[model samples]
Target chain A: NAMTDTEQTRALARKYFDTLNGRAWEEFAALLAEDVRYELPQTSERITGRADYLRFNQEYPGDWQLTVTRLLADGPSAAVSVNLTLGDERLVGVVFLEVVDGLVSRVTDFWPEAYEPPPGREHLVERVPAELDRFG
Target chain B: AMTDTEQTRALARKYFDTLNGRAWEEFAALLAEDVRYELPQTSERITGRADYLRFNQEYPGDWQLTVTRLLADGPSAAVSVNLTLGDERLVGVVFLEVVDGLVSRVTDFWPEAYEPPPGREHLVERVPAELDRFG
Candidate 1:
């Protein structure tokens, strides 16, 4: 395939979530490099290599579904914004994926939770539904 | 305005540089006339370059930003920034869309830190600090 790395990785990133949602374990494993590194900063957790990282997701308990709200890819780097539903709780995730030789080499993921707006800045701001249809 | 990958990357850097440098006019020049800026976390959207400019100019505090990471390809760029104001620090992620060499759409996210919920302790170890850049 003559896909530019940007286009290739962009599509790869989208397919990643699809595989997870579909429970396509083999396809998901195929997309990751053997030495892939996955980090979840919020929990200061890391699952190194394809095996552990894949198992981490596989064992994650929940009827979770991922929707890619927005994605941007350039070169070998891609950033994805996702809306996730875990049962009744809706959440947002910001993820950065790096591709090397057509396989994912690293993934850095951040999960940001919602909270009531802080005091102050209320004059210059208005509240909108956090679950609105937009990723950004 | 940027026409290629290099320009897009440079402009993305200038975006924070100009603002952090307090070069309001220079920063304003990087925006399209009808730029769209929105913060999904707060559910706030600002239309037009001028209004967004005023919003930043009128924002309180002596906040500063340092880019922790940036990725740019073609007309799109995303940056992770550490925003500091006195003792408080937060992480900001910015997604940019550029056309005609100027930014047309911008999406910003400000994530607040919190205590990790229980149940995931088995998968993670304790980190000495929350944010490595400012901690």
Candidate 2:
């Protein structure tokens, strides 16, 4: 039986992250379009073509691991919340994926790092226990 | 007539619109009385509608927010908020849970600016804007 578009996209998205996290380089590369467009809008960087994009991830430093906290897939578009860890640094990666023809054609990633909480929210906000924090 | 998903998505948009418009009272009205607001990056949380309202009110900034992307599934919605304070633009990823048309819980992630990591310098080229800072 054929999978619905939603199911296909969701499965593709899951595979995208799982393959990357598992370092299944061949499987990960297989999920992308030939001329995929990968973007890091925060840093204003863009990498075009699947080969270069795959190499970009392959060459990325650190013993980083990924965990998908949340995923929402609708038709051809999907958004995912990824918890990434590299040694002592814990970061959250929010990724938006555009799937075309059963392959990912476009990817946008947001890497948000930890910083001091800005002032003025102290009175109303309280620090959560470390164990309860998912990404930290 | 709008479906529940549409209404939920609309509320999510309204949440940011009022915030960018600085419509504090209107924004407050959109929250549930016992709404819970959280900032996962800092692991800071605010409980109750009143305090949550004040948290945004007291937030010091001339920042503006734009809802670049919104996805809704049943009572749960996620939004990509583009926050700008002058030339500096930041992204806020928020997951919201709605109950009876009001926002009941919000989990927000504000990703700060950072220089791209090394090692991918061969395959990736930094855009002109980032060239000056990290070039």
Candidate 3:
């Protein structure tokens, strides 16, 4: 049976996490398209290509367990709600994936639970404009 | 001054209400000639000017207000809307945007004051999936 576009993309996400869980680096490479691009919003740097992506993953070596809160797919595009926990520090984020030719071509990460100010940058307080008074 | 594409898009949404509300004729003319489309649980479908004209003709005077947050750059676009359906017969309708001159998509998210089925999970998790068999 031919896999629907949504099904293919969803399966890819599950397979991707399974690889990460099992430390199957070689198998994970097969899921990427030729023009793979990965972006981490927290650190405005982009990683392109499978080699660079794998190397970056190895360098990061995330010890946290990823809890997928939700996974949504729409044809060649998908979004996953995720939470990362390492020790006592927990980071909650979302991942947006784009599939092209049945392979994941783009992955973008967004952090919604980043309400806390970053370290050393906590001193700056943005003043509200007078014209924007009475915000409910 | 002539309104740019971005301005036109921004106004297209706000004009629905904030700019004196939307009229069926005006909304029909706003759509592109050949529009691409997709829904929340459906595959993408490409539609042309005729399809749009047919839609407007079939469903006239069925308009609702949409409070929107927009994001647009070049030909790609995304918009979120909060809808309020005044009539009971026309309740729970979603607001949408037609992007890139031809892609119509909707981001469906509605607010509720009280708990609703299958959705209370957002407020509470780990509910008993199965009732205890008291034997």
Candidate 4:
């Protein structure tokens, strides 16, 4: 039976959360194509290819337990708000998902943790290194 | 002899570069025992760790680079980093770290680059139909 876009999207989102919750490694891997890419903006880390992805997953064991707060859909693209839990550590971040053919093609996350400017300082201003101007 | 603040900081910055370069194992194990954390505004998906960190280097090994502008003072730190994927899009994220003794807690905040609203046609000296093609 052919799945409708809505059905497929709902299933994909469910699959994403279920796989994480179930710790179904193989099942989770099957949900992404061979060339899937994942990105997390806060760390400026991006993983390309599935092999690296599998390895990446293994490294962060029990890294996060997510509780989705909101789910917004735009056809095959959807955004989810999640409350990530790890031990006593807690943070807020967003997971942006792109579904292709009933599978998640890519996932981008934005993590914003609270920040306090240095004491006696209002903000930190970045200055480009003079030497690196050539690289730019 | 204890490491000077400057020396400790230089090492810290190098630590970040290595992580961006896919040096995950080294990065993960680098966190101090009592690391502090903070996030900006609010978020819904992430929690517990008090920071947004990646495990890219641990899972898959590859060659990737990031450009960063850094500002540091004493035990406090900040950096504005640019993440580029070939030629598609550029993301800007900021990091603030507080180091104590042999441990440090680094917090990251990522705000998407703002895009200005498109302006309507303006009265100029000369106009070309090609102007419509710009959009």
Most DockQ-accurate candidate: 2
Q: Give per-residue CA lDDT, model 3, range B19-120, as digits (tens).
A: 125454565555566543222211122255455445434433445544333433233333333333344211111224445443343222221122222322
Candidate 1 structure quality by residue, lDDT tens digits, A14-123: 88878978899999999999998876665556667888778777777869888888788888888888887876777788888889998999887777666555555555
Better of 2 and 4 by lDDT: 2
Model 3 chain B weakest 10-residue run by lDDT: B126-135
The stretch of ten residues in a row with the least summed lDDT in candidate 4 chain A is A127-136
Residue B30's lDDT in candidate 4 = 58
Off by over 4 Å in 1: A119-123, A129-136, B1-4, B128-135
Best by lDDT: 2
Candidate 1, CAPRI quality class derived from DockQ: acceptable
- Off-target runs (Cα >4 Å) in candidate 3 are A114-136, B1-135
Q: Estimate each model's TM-score.
A: 0.86, 0.88, 0.44, 0.44
**What are the root-mean-square deviations of the candidates from the true structure over C-alphas?**
3.0, 3.4, 19.5, 21.0
> B15-67, model 1: which lDDT tens digit per residue?
88998998999999999998888777667767788888887888888899988
Instruction: Score candidate 4 by lDDT.
Output: 0.50
Q: What's the alpha carbon RMSD for model 1?
A: 3.0
What is the Cα-based TM-score of model 1?
Answer: 0.86
Docking class of 4: incorrect
- The residue-level lDDT of candidate 2 at B43 comes to 77
**What shift in Å separates residue B113 of candidate 2 from its native position after superposition?**
1.7
Better of 2 and 4 by TM-score: 2
User: Between which residue pairs do clashes occur in model 2?
Assistant: none
lDDT value, residue A133 of candidate 1: 31
